[PDB]
């Protein structure tokens, strides 16, 4: 269930509410400002890191479940999504239907959105690929 959720369900949740469109009305007292701006923020592919921890001084290193159990940390990994910013503008002529165009500010760009706790021995955890000797090296019970 956790491997299904990480591999497939996370992207499905991201893609369900991916596009966030904001339309700014012209609010033009004079006809010199007859432009309407349409700003769109769209989430793309989601990325997940290996389990890791950021400490007080900002250093981020790989976190193993033995250390996370001892140091009372959370065995979690970062989630990164691709965000593309779309900027659409059109001439606000009343009566005429607005036809938006890009101003070529299509900036895109992984952004950190949070830490997903990783269930042990799942595909994201370090212990999945570990052999018995590797588990003994990490002080984990095989």
């Amino acid at each position: 269930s956790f491997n299904q959720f990480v591999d497939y369900t996370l992207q499905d949740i991201i893609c369900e509410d991916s596009t966030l469109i904001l339309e700014q009305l012209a609010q033009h007292t004079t006809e010199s400002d007859n432009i309407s701006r349409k700003y769109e923020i769209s989430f793309g592919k989601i990325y997940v890191t290996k389990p890791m921890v950021n400490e007080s001084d900002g250093v981020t290193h790989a976190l193993y479940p033995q250390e996370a159990r001892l140091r009372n940390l959370t065995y979690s990994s970062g989630l990164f999504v691709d965000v593309k910013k779309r900027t659409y503008e059109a001439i606000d002529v009343p009566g005429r239907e607005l036809k938006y165009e890009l101003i070529a500010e299509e900036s895109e760009g992984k952004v950190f959105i949070g830490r997903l706790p990783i269930m042990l021995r799942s595909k994201n955890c370090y212990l999945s690929e570990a052999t018995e000797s590797d588990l003994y090296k990490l002080k984990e019970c095989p």
Binding site: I21, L22, Q24, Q27
Partner: peptide
């Protein structure tokens, strides 16, 4: 007086 900005439900 008119609302400057609004949410557009993408479809």
């Amino acid at each position: 007086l008119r609302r400057k900005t609004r949410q557009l439900k993408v479809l």
